[PDB]
Design a protein around this ligand. Structure first.
Ligand SMILES: Nc1ccc2[nH]ncc2c1
Length: 115
């Protein structure tokens, strides 16, 4: 509270570390459904169903331009990619499996790096 400061974690390396994690996701072989925005003109249903589209290239642009206030907002956008994937794809599909794989991959990197 006012004038009562909690010790806080050193956050000076957060930007660099999120960038490295995002690089590892960008170069994963199962990243292909997530590298660019879904084409809302060509994919039926996506625009109406998925209220907040997100993809790795958009996360990279936001990270590179100071649009994440902290590392938690970065993780929220990453998880949004995989939550959108589950909403729109059957678990059994190639894209559905890719999303579950990438989520697992991310969360381990996240835990190992920050927790
Ligand atoms: N053609 C095609 C098939 C499955 C898809 N999931 N998301 C986009 C998309 C496009």
């Amino acid at each position: 509270s006012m004038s009562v400061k909690k010790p806080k974690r050193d956050d000076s390396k957060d930007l660099a570390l999120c960038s490295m994690i995002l690089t590892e996701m960008e170069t994963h072989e199962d990243a292909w459904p997530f590298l660019l925005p879904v084409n809302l003109k060509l994919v039926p249903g996506y625009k109406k169903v998925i209220k907040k589209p997100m993809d790795f290239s958009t996360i990279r642009e936001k990270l590179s331009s100071g649009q994440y206030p902290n590392l938690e907002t970065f993780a929220l956008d990453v998880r949004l990619v995989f939550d959108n994937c589950e909403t729109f794809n059957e678990d059994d599909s190639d894209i559905g499996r890719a999303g579950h794989n990438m989520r697992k991959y991310f969360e381990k990197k996240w835990t190992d790096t920050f927790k």
